[PDB]
Write a protein that binds this ligand. Structure first.
Ligand SMILES: Cc1ncc(COP(=O)(O)O)c(C=O)c1O
Ligand SMILES: *Cc1c(COP(=O)(O)O)cnc(C)c1O
Ligand SMILES: O=C(O)[C@@H](O)Cc1ccccc1
Ligand SMILES: O=C(O)[C@@H](O)Cc1ccccc1
Ligand SMILES: [Mg+2]
Lengths: 398, 398
């Protein structure tokens, strides 16, 4: 009966974590997953969240269906965070926003909308990009190519080729952009660079789709959303898929939003409708618990202030781990320059190791990174940072 | 830019519920949505759930991603409920199970898997069925038809006619079947009738997709799964989408499951694999809270036992309401037989009122039913029972 059914290779990341989890090396460290850990190496329960969740259990309440859009609190929360507290675009009401099943869910609802209403639109992702970016869009029958982003030699963006690619693209083609914290490279666009990408986007009449999963981990909430707030002011139409998984440390509850920026208030009334429609045929409505935590935190002034604070802290620890790594490498290896490590943003570092080098850190050390060299800086703490840095030196000297 | 986008109308049930909210009428009653309400007309928090949630709140824990297939306890939870604890089929390891974003999430993943691997398969739903059933399958670009089911003149099933229709479908065509508690009519197949349906399905080699959203509201957990369990013995390739929304009274948390019964261990691995692949490409992972509630309630024997009793309570309450409705209507109306009301099962009832008659109930009484006559019996309690039946009498008398 199910002879035709093909085996799954697994999520390429989770294929690695599986190898790690069923490997019993004493010294093993996992730096191959986009999860934030603290100094003890454990996943933090944020204080603001802990408060949100105690409000929820006091008392345990009946659990009706959330609106398909999710709770308005969630919906406002996303908007004020992405665009600005009482921002002009929001004042206008030119942004359609739903709660989604994390960032993933937001991209899916977004992607489906695009497949249906713009069948002729192709989608383009960075070279390289996150794995699920391609899978989600292709899963909608969207044809997916890649724009050149990362330059192997410099270790920065291949900007000249990139803008040139964008010229060769048709009206309504979809550009899957990372406003900050590039996954997996860590190499972000400069604020001047964004203005160049966007002005081409306005001219070439293209569609910008922005995937911001790590707001508050680049520079800060407001700075990280620069690409978002600019495109808006340029009057451009734009899709914004946001995630609270990392910055809220709530991966499990599947919290996130999709926001769509429209020329008109009426056009927004239409888009919002089709978003609910798209949700209806997928999962019907977002989960209550997750929705409530977002609502509580984003809308409680004190809790919100407290939240921005703890994200600042997480960001800072990462920035700090980037420094210590650069320190130990520059000290023990006189030859190469490792400024890219502290130049890169958010949770990821393309450590610029060859696929053979990444292999070596795995066999002898129990140090896991992706074949393309991506490393989650958040996997590093005082207690293990020493070991990893030396191992990288040893693999670099080889 | 989005001028190609047409307005959504809204979910028709939600349009009816919305209409109910804005009603002036002091005595308005909502019988239009398939939510269980207790003898007071409030959504209940199950005691077993209260206990689970407080276990989750003590202490509040880190929130890592659930496996794509959800927690193993949630899966074991589902499998045991549907197929029966220590089912041969479960012992053989021949069911691929994932946690899903409610029943809707199970239907979606299910449909998407079918669209992928059986592109020529068409899907047939019962006439009539739950509105949202079509949306999901059409939402996958699967062509959807209607197999004859409910007979209007008799108020039963056009069974003879149905079986012949099934003889006319192609290999691997998909039948969406309500094992019990048919939404929206409440008219169910007898155990005999089910053997014939499954025999044809076997012979024509059709795919039976069972959507069970009300397990324990028909007769009981075992009886309601009879179609599921018979299907299994016959060696049929079964798809079961189970919702916990209603029986676990946890709609908001989006708890359900999807299970695929396979000939071999290897086919189960391939299918399990692809089920993950599908989940990854949609939303990545199911929500942590709802999953944990399910895991806790199902796999704690004292809680499982308590849960089951609390469902049967709800079942028994619905049942008394049917009895009382029949009683009152038979008292004040002659030339009609009201045994169909007690002949039906679960939360829904095709009450046999004309579209105009439903219209009069809303207009003067604020009694809200679907135009096709579906009534959620679970919106009836001793406080409104007399009011509703009398209103039904008035509308029927003329
Ligand atoms: C680059 C990127 N974008 C978006 C997401 C959204 O995923 P989630 O469902 O956890 O929000 C992720 C998650 O890892 C990601 O890595
Ligand atoms: C409610 C329901 C489902 C599942 O809907 P969810 O809210 O996602 O759990 C499936 N089938 C029927 C007939 C239903 O009434
Ligand atoms: O970029 C990363 O490394 C994470 O997105 C990986 C991941 C996402 C979702 C689920 C499991 C794993
Ligand atoms: O059949 C019904 O109407 C409800 O049981 C389920 C539902 C109602 C409204 C919206 C979504 C889902
Ligand atoms: Mg499709």
């Amino acid at each position: 009966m199910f002879e035709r059914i093909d085996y799954y290779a697994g999520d390429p990341i989770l294929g690695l974590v599986e190898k790690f989890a069923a490997d019993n090396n004493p010294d093993k460290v996992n730096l191959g997953i986009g999860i934030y850990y603290d100094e003890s190496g454990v996943m933090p329960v944020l204080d603001c969240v802990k408060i949100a969740e105690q409000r929820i259990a006091d008392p345990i309440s009946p659990r009706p269906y959330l609106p398909m859009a999710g709770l308005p609190g969630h919906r406002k929360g996303c908007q004020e965070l992405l665009f600005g507290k009482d921002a002009p675009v929001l004042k206008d009401g030119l942004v359609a926003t739903i709660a989604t099943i994390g960032g993933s869910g937001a991209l899916k609802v977004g992607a489906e909308f695009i497949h249906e209403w713009f069948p002729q639109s192709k989608c383009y992702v960075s070279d390289p990009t996150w794995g699920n970016h391609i899978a989600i869009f292709e899963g909608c029958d969207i044809e997916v190519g890649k724009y050149p982003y990362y330059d192997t030699a410099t270790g920065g963006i291949k900007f000249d080729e990139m803008i040139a690619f964008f010229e060769t693209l048709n009206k309504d083609d979809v550009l899957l952009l990372h406003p900050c914290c590039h996954n997996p490279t860590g190499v972000d666009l400069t604020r001047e660079q964004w203005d160049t990408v966007l002005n081409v986007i306005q001219e070439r009449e293209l569609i910008p789709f922005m995937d911001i999963a790590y707001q508050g981990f680049g520079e800060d909430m407001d700075s990280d959303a620069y690409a978002i707030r600019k495109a808006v002011d340029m009057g451009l139409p734009l899709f914004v898929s946001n995630s609270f998984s990392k910055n809220l440390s709530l991966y499990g509850e599947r919290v996130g939003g999709l926001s769509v920026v429209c020329p008109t208030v009426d056009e927004t009334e239409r888009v919002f409708g089709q978003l609910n429609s798209t949700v209806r045929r997928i999962y019907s409505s977002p989960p209550s618990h997750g929705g409530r935590v977002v609502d509580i935190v984003m809308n409680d002034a004190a809790l919100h202030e407290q939240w921005v604070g703890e994200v600042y802290a997480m960001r800072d620890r990462i920035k700090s781990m980037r420094t210590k790594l650069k320190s130990v490498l520059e000290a023990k290896i006189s030859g190469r320059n490792f400024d890219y490590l502290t130049a890169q943003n958010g949770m990821f570092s393309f450590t610029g190791l060859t696929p053979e080098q990444v292999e070596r850190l795995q066999s002898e050390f129990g140090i896991y990174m992706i074949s393309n060299s991506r490393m989650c800086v958040a996997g590093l703490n005082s207690s293990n940072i020493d070991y990893v840095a030396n191992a990288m030196v040893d693999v670099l000297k080889d």
